[PDB]
Design a protein around this ligand. Structure first.
Ligand SMILES: Cc1cc(C)c(NC(=O)[C@H]2C[C@@H]3CC[C@H]2C3)c(C)c1
Ligand SMILES: Cc1cc(C)c(NC(=O)[C@H]2C[C@@H]3CC[C@H]2C3)c(C)c1
Ligand SMILES: Cc1cc(C)c(NC(=O)[C@H]2C[C@@H]3CC[C@H]2C3)c(C)c1
Ligand SMILES: Cc1cc(C)c(NC(=O)[C@H]2C[C@@H]3CC[C@H]2C3)c(C)c1
Ligand SMILES: [K+]
Ligand SMILES: [K+]
Ligand SMILES: [K+]
Lengths: 141, 333, 333, 141, 333, 333, 141, 141
């Protein structure tokens, strides 16, 4: 039944029944929701799961990505390595205020409400320090 | 808990200094090393008939101070394992409840203490396992990690070296043993011949066993010229691999551009997590793009990447003129 | 033939495990190695006066089990040579009808069996040729292939090393022989001097022969400082070549993009073949383009490649903008 | 006589009698037959046989290519290496259905009728497995 | 001061020749080297009972000429320290007023002169410190600078080599000492075992101490095969690092394009200096750009620059088209 | 002269085979080598009391055949020096009229013939200079050219190795001599100490001289661990340089595209020459461009080129867009 | 007070009070004074002090640059290395006429009046030779 | 007097008396004679003698080039290396007919009359073989 629900999502992209998702199908569904990816961003996204290298996503590749999410060990390690960039002490901790600065000032910045939900979800200590390795296991569970 | 907080902060400082070495705060490490070294020094000064009283009293005082200091160091290590609270002892339990390096050192320490209190072998083999206790550094294996990585990288080819070298050893030992079996009494057996061959091909050359006939001498010279190099390859292979790896370390640490990729990966992961089907599938794809860009900056970014983006960018350039071309042709002509 | 198919499938599995090693199914290899090693172990434990009865019975039982196991292994190898049928025995005949590794092992096995059944030399030299029988792995030459490639690559320069080293050997041996001929009795002849020179320049240095006069000592020191390095170059050259080749192996296997090129090449070859003059000439040219692209993706792709398409891409850019410029002139102005 | 027949084909390209084939002559004959190579594809084709490096094919180069076809040992080895990409067992076999998938789904895909003729021409075993090394010798004979 | 100017110009020439070596004017260096070498030669020719009169008179005459020449050389060095005037003696004072290489040589010279005038140890240890006086070249450390840089670059990994080697030394010495303690009298103590282990693992192999039992022989062979390579790694690591650094030097001298960057930097610095707030802030930013471009050309310019500039330039080109495209759509359609 | 032409053509063939080795026609080289080697073989078989008659007759017959063959080979070499005519003898005179390798071999040959016809020293030292006569290959220095180039490239750094090694030798020899002067009789003098130090630091380790006190042993161990590596650096440096140079040879032989550049250079040179002021100045500038492009293709082509040509092409493209933009502005808007 | 004067200059660039200087703010103030930097020159200038890598200068970065000027040891060494390019003797001297040639003929050439002031400011010796290392300390003081 | 004649040629390029030759001055004189160099060819030509790297030729650089012509040892060696590309025998000879093919079919091809003068000037042997190393010394004399 989980496979059938993935198939129904896959068919929203591949409305023609061709069994593939190209940049046209992916980007069309995304822009209908009000997103505006570039062509190079749509190619990068498809390339992450396109083993055949022909610029498409087929259902086996789609199902694999959906079943896996972030649960794999590669994801847990890399996310933990990203936090460690901002942990100079090396003790596995990061300050709530330092997490807030990085999340709202670097990269694809989180909004205030996004970052508020993120700090609420981490079981912050009374000092104001966050143990990010248990934060990584909650996102990889 | 402010005074408790400050005391716990000093405690975490001492935890790092006993746990992670730094540029300057290596005095604890160097003093533990000096303790073990001095103990080995009087151990070697023993067994030459000086343990009469001057080496013996030194042994007693050093064993006393050593047992005392390692007891308190184990205490302080476990007692400062974590941060202020909930880490100091709790992730202490979390770590040592099941660890192949936590309670084993305790077992060794208590067993040696029991043996000493209630010959040379016990004392010395205890001490060298204490040099392993200072191997502990960088999780018992920093140097071991490095060496293992480099050895494993050159596996098949070290295997070539070892295997050809061992064939030459066996076959040369046999041929010289046959050529020297009658006259020379050094080559009594074939095991003697292997001893001679091992000492020769490694270029130690003690000289206790040596060919005497001209046939044996010629065979030994030929097989030496042919196998000495094979017994010296592993050092050359490993040394060159070492130097190359250092050069590459320079090359790649010159990149290290994980400022935005670092932060963006955590954001794509949080956005995906906070989703909880098509909307989720899009966030998974973006998460996977961010994880790759995050790894790439460290080391997967290479020279192939340049050409990858060249093709992409220049095809865009070719089609940019074509965008204008279609326009021109459809209107003006 | 379904039961036959399944039995033949298990048979092909055992063929691969006895033929191609893998990550885990190396137990047959390691056990054959252990058999040969243990046989060599009691061979070396012999010739020290222990073959009285305990080494002799062990020799008998090991020769018995060894003859039995290699007989059945030869049987199984030939009997599992191919797949289920038409390969199991037929390309078996196709392979061993004329092969420099198929029937030679049989000849060796039967000759040794005849010699043993119906001194130390026969037993041992048979055993070491059995270590060659385990050289058989990877067609008798995996390690040999690697070593030969690397040696051949550095040919001229190994030649330099060898030749300069040998000149220094000869000339130094002569000079020290002249300087030590009268006093020292070690240097009785010139052949003795060559023995001394070989042992010295390889840095074995047994010490049985040694210069005694000051002139001879000075000459020996000078020629040692000058030639020892030449006798150590080959190991350094080969080791560095080895490490460099490993690094390059990393570099090029990071590419390895022959998914589509592989298909493309088979397709252009089929299309050319199925033609059976101008139409054929075009298919030959396309086949040759596909064969090149197929090799390139593995390793011929270089750094010149990057700029080969740079110039090409800029030429396209130039072409289209020039066509646009003339277009503008024609219509707008 | 075989040389004269190659010369007559060569003269269809080089209609001016200049003794050379450029991208103009090659591409013109190709498009007359309804092919549509790009300029970069015409340059690659000429470059495979142009030893002088001046962008032309002369008759000695043309004759060499035509006399050789795929009979050389380099062609036999590389074609066999291409099949081996798709032989994971390492036994020199590939399934008829796996050959069909690769031929019609990767690269310059074969049509159904092309791939039908290709599988008919290989002496397929009763299991459905193809010994591709004898398939390579039939194309290199 | 024209005659003074010419004399001072000849004096600065002699200052460079005594200070900076060149392609041809190395005769002063080679003669000082020859003086020290010849003095060491008669020092070694002494202590074999030849200082009767022929070595002794040579010692007297050489000590005489040496004291004289180094006195005048110190005089000329300080007296030619700088240029014509205001540098000859004044920056001479500026340099030697507080320098760890200026007055120390004077102290050594006067102390040795006092000792000699008003056994072998004094003479010889004075002479070797004079070979350090010729170490002085390139500020006492040209070779030392090079070696230190290369050693420091490979620090962690030389540490791996040393530390594993020393563990093998200790543990092997112990095991062989236990295996050979009873029978063999060479291994009287454990200190003897360390002497044997050091001589073995370095592959010197004197042969004075040697295992005699089979257990000890087997242990020695195993530990030799395992540790000899570790004692030979440092040479391989350093040699490969040396060769790699030379290759990189070729590439660094291929660049070195500081014709205009040099001028540019001096100009931006002068323009900033001559300012003496927003106008100044702009000149500081331009100065910092010029300092970077000035360093980059020498070495910091990497491959990343090319990739970055590709993206930049490609986007400039794409933006060019984009501006034109919007224009076209506005007017023509 | 057609028959003369054919005979001269065969003569030029034999000139190349005696002058330039090839893949297959090395039989003359290998036979000259075998002649010299066999002569050295009976020379070494002499001086062990076998020149009674069997070695002596062999010496006579080999000296006879050797004198004969080298006479005719010199004849044929000079007589085939050039091509058919005007080169065979005339540029023969042009070459040997003044050459440091032409008439010197003749002088050596005639002098040795005079000495032999009208002890071991003459015969042998003549023979080894004949191995130099086979050094002649590739103008006496192919291997020498290669080795000299690589040594010269790493000059400063080999100097570092040698100089640090020699300081350690001297200072260690002195310290051990002082520590062992009284008890041990091996270290009678300081020259003995240098002999011991040379044999130790090169890791020959004869064992005739060996420290006996514990102070001397400790000093020897320390200085061994510190200097053995320095005496082994030169081999490592040279070997790594060798391997790197081979890798670079591959890299650059992959380019080697001097067909058209070489062809164009001759044309620009002829066009400049045939001029015989502004017109000439232009031809000189074009000649200089063609000479550079001709060299570049071989090896000056670097990675700097890539960067340079990217910028050039990018700006050409940008300039073309500027033309297009100004057109649009002028007409449409 | 020195910090407040830097803040007042910083606010001329960042007139909106956003706490950042982009290429827009920097280049606008520069062109108002009659300078004409290119976009790539404005990016290089900001990149020299932008640690966050987001294309801006904030006040802490601005203050650091203004407080430091050329007084740091890196500046003294690099400026001295630039003079040494033109000191072949290696004696730490350069001729007044050679300095004049390099300053007015290479790079962003100094005007005659600029270079006249520069040679006046160096305490030129009677020969006409300039000790540039004391010239470097006057600009780094 | 030779220097003054070089100066008079140099002044035809630098008609303004600025002491420099740029691509404008060089290319203008060349096109007046009916030559048509490209801009990239004019930059390459100036770059061969522009030590200052500022895109100009000054009179000292012009005089050096004119005084030297091809007489230097680098020119003799490189020209001789170019002939050796076409000498497979390695005997220092090349056939008259092979020289003719290379001169008129590769590179900036010589006309028939140019190549006729070139073969007339080499003292051709009776066989038809050219000793090109003495041909190189006549162009480097
Ligand atoms: C024949 C032979 C000769 C030798 C020197 C070795 N040993 C090595 O090469 C050592 C270097 C690494 C680390 C321990 C090994 C492997 C072996 C195993 C076999
Ligand atoms: C003078 C001399 C010295 C030596 C060490 C050798 N031998 C080698 O160098 C060995 C390493 C490879 C493998 C066998 C050879 C070649 C030779 C042939 C001549
Ligand atoms: C175990 C061990 C073995 C050795 C050869 C050394 N020594 C070296 O490796 C020398 C090469 C550099 C220069 C002096 C050191 C370091 C050390 C320190 C320890
Ligand atoms: C201290 C010392 C130690 C050594 C081994 C050498 N010799 C070398 O290193 C040889 C390798 C090249 C070729 C001959 C030299 C140079 C020298 C000169 C000094
Ligand atoms: K030795
Ligand atoms: K020895
Ligand atoms: K040795």
């Amino acid at each position: 039944e989980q496979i059938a629900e993935f198939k129904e999502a896959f068919s929203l992209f591949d409305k023609d029944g061709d069994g593939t998702i190209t940049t046209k199908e992916l980007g069309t569904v995304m822009r209908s929701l009000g997103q505006n990816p570039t062509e190079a961003e749509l190619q990068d996204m498809i390339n992450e799961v396109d083993a055949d290298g022909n610029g498409t996503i087929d259902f086996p590749e789609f199902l694999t990505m959906m079943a896996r999410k972030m649960k794999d060990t590669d994801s847990e390690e890399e996310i933990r390595e990203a936090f460690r960039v901002f942990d100079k002490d090396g003790n596995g901790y990061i300050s709530a205020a330092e997490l807030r600065h990085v999340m709202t000032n670097l990269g694809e910045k989180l909004t205030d409400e996004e970052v508020d939900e993120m700090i609420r979800e981490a079981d912050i200590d009374g000092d104001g320090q966050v143990n990010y390795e248990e934060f990584v296991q909650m996102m990889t569970a | 808990s402010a005074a408790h907080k400050r005391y716990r902060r000093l405690q975490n400082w001492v935890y790092n200094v006993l746990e992670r070495p730094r540029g300057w705060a290596f005095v604890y490490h160097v003093f533990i090393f000096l303790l073990v070294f001095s103990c080995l020094v009087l151990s070697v000064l023993s067994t030459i008939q000086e343990h009469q009283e001057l080496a013996n009293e030194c042994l007693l005082i050093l064993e006393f101070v050593m047992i005392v200091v390692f007891g308190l160091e184990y205490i302080v290590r476990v007692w400062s394992a974590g941060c202020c609270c909930r880490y100091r002892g709790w992730q202490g339990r979390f770590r040592f409840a099941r660890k192949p390096f936590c309670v084993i050192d305790f077992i060794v320490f208590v067993a040696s203490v029991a043996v000493i209190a209630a010959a040379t072998s016990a004392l010395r083999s205890m001490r060298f396992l204490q040099i392993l206790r200072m191997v502990r550094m960088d999780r018992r294996g920093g140097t071991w990690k490095l060496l293992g990585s480099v050895v494993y990288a050159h596996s098949k080819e070290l295997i070539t070296a070892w295997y050809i070298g061992f064939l030459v050893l066996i076959f040369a030992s046999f041929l010289v043993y046959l050529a020297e079996k009658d006259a020379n009494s050094d080559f009594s057996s074939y095991a003697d011949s292997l001893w001679w061959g091992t000492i020769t091909l490694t270029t130690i050359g003690y000289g206790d066993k040596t060919p005497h006939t001209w046939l044996g001498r010629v065979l030994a010279a030929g097989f030496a010229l042919l196998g000495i190099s094979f017994f010296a390859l592993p050092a050359g292979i490993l040394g060159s691999g070492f130097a190359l790896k250092v050069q590459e370390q320079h090359r790649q640490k010159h990149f290290e551009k994980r400022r935005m990729p670092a932060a963006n990966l955590i954001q794509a992961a949080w956005r995906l997590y906070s989703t909880d089907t098509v909307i989720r599938s899009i966030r998974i794809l973006k998460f996977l793009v961010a994880k790759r860009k995050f790894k790439e900056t460290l080391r997967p970014y290479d020279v192939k990447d340049v050409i990858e983006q060249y093709s992409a960018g220049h095809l865009d350039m070719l089609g940019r003129i074509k965008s204008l071309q279609t326009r021109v042709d459809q209107i003006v002509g």
